[PDB]
Symmetry: C3
């Protein structure tokens, strides 16, 4: 099976501010030596559902994986909601190896004492758009294997950062396509 995903529904699965306040829509499709990824994020409740002038314009969604490529429970994304695809849902077996979906550790090494700043290639940076409004850019930073916490073997994080005042709006962004080299 060649896709890992959250499912495409809008049932909350993720933490932006508080637990299960948001829907991360994420699909990872294996394409040989790369995964083709597609991501977006919606705030369903809580502060990011109706932002204020003081809301933090920087949200990080962390997916931490063990050595089998299985999501760790300390991730921002709930495990209930994350598995191999089956129709528009997921497979019933909870604990399925997924090393071939993990980001390559040579391309994207964990940070170390060896070399201070890590390679910029460990990140993808671009813009997505809040509310699908062209005048409302939000910077998406995708980082590969740059987390060490909770004993993780691999990581994929999605950070959204912006400068303009989006108060009174619901955080919701356009979809973003990306790829990365696999283990």
């Amino acid at each position: 099976r060649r896709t890992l995903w959250t499912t495409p529904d809008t049932s909350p699965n993720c933490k932006m501010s508080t637990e299960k306040d948001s829907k991360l829509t994420l699909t990872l499709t294996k394409c040989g030596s790369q995964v083709l990824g597609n991501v977006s994020l919606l705030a369903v409740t809580g502060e990011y559902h109706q932002m204020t002038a003081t809301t933090k314009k920087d949200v990080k969604i962390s997916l931490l994986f063990d050595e089998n490529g299985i999501l760790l429970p300390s991730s921002s994304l709930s495990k209930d909601y994350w598995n191999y695809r089956s129709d528009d849902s997921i497979v019933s077996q909870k604990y399925n190896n997924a090393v071939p979906f993990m980001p390559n550790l040579t391309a994207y090494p964990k940070p170390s004492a060896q070399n201070a700043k890590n390679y910029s290639r460990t990140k993808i940076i671009s813009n997505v758009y809040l509310g699908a409004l062209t005048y409302q850019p939000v910077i998406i930073t995708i980082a590969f294997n740059q987390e060490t916490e909770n004993g993780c073997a691999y990581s994929i994080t999605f950070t959204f950062t912006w400068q303009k005042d989006y108060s009174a709006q619901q955080f919701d962004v356009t979809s973003f396509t990306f790829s990365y080299l696999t283990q």
Copy 2:
């Protein structure tokens, strides 16, 4: 067969202003649960071939599909010009099911009375560049399943929108890569 396309030639196939004034180059390659898409647009004749100060800085190219995934004749793209790949041309059979290329209706639901504003994930927004000149951004908005007209089951639309004055120039943009979840 795993690619639907316009063919890569420059024979006009599309309407920007008037019928068959432009070449839409579009390739959809099936990659499991995603299509990998690649698009660009060129004006061959008519107003967008030599824009004026009053030309509309907003062009929408609509591909409408029936429940079989087959292009409807009311689309901006001519059907003559759109089919499964065979060499650098298309297959001879005109009417081939293509549901596995269609955008997923759970990820990208049609608009309804149920929920006012639709999910931003139904769109991709980025920049492409007019004339391949780095100082001439044009915003591309790709939208999935957001059309209802003509009884369509699915839709993919490409809107190009800009602010700067590109008068006297030919509309022609750099290629854009994207993906989406499939039915």
Copy 3:
């Protein structure tokens, strides 16, 4: 075999200013009628390793290919460092046909006397980010089949161009994903 790459290590393989001053990380994965590509560039030594106020804010990395799809020795990328994937390295056979990885000559024709300016679809233009810092955009231009020198049959070039003063910094950019139609 469905991936051509540089390998994901940081051993210098490329010329920005002087020979083997930099690491081009490039992976081309065949996906039917498209290649899914992923690129980034790091300066390891020389001027781009510690830029000055006079360093040229325009670097072109040229991959030139023969009619078999094999890299020509006059390319910016060293051939030693470029082959079909095998684990995290490359296959031992040096000279492997790769026409199915080459950019389509109908979609991306070489430049000619026939039609002055070439089609903008021959290029992809976007931003990547120096040092993975969101305030440091660098424009990446990918061009397909636009070189004629050294008798090349095909070409893929990566040009990085910028305006801001990045003096004292090491040239290093975030990863960029793209696709193109294949021969």
